[model samples]
Target: SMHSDLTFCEIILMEMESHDAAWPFLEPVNPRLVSGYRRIIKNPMDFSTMRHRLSRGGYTSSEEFAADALLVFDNCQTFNEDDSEVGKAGHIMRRFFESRWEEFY
Candidate 1:
């Protein structure tokens, strides 16, 4: 099976993971979702604008380069006390954020 075989939702999840990793380094990094993107729109949804910026910054990796997965399988999805949102949807979205690459990949 290849990456192209993945469903669109899967790809979005992957991009979010990538976005999560680089979130710390993105200029004007913010805990708020909109603000995080506001500094510079990027990711798959934004047509890779931020991705190119991060790459130029030197985050070299095949995942970052090819699939644009940006690197790693870290649990950056874990909610922070400062992270925006409080309660239900955030809780569930947080769960959805966790990786199970055995199943995901």
Candidate 2:
């Protein structure tokens, strides 16, 4: 399943297609396709900085700003996860866990 962490990137890339491609929301963070972004940075520390935005997120910041870049990264990355099926599932699960729905019982 796409939600599983064990699935390799190559397999996911090969697997993506028109049928599996469904926009998660009515109006997504970006109108572009999920696979449009060529690379992903899994490193929390690396993503916390200003570079990811200007490059991937389409904005920029400086090292001197946001000492808690990881916090900023966490906040910003939420919007970016709209890009992939697996990423979307992760976001949904994270929210579900946070919400503490009794359905888990």
Cα lDDT tens digits, model 1, 33-93, are 4334323333322224434434354334334432433221121223233354322333443
Question: What CA RMSD would candidate 2 show?
Answer: 13.9
Give, for candidate 1, the lowest lDDT window spanning 10 residues: 70-79
lDDT per residue (tens digit) for residues 1-105 in model 2: 122331232232223211232123212223275543224433333221333332343332222222323333343355465665645643553353224323322
Clashes of each: 0, 1
The regions of model 1 sitting more than 4 angstroms off are 1-94
Local lDDT at 45 for model 2 = 31
Task: Provide the overall lDDT of each model, using Cα atoms, as 2-decimal numbers.
Answer: 0.36, 0.33
Show model 2 residue runs off by greater than 4 Å.
Answer: 1-80, 101-105
The number of the candidate with the highest lDDT is: 1
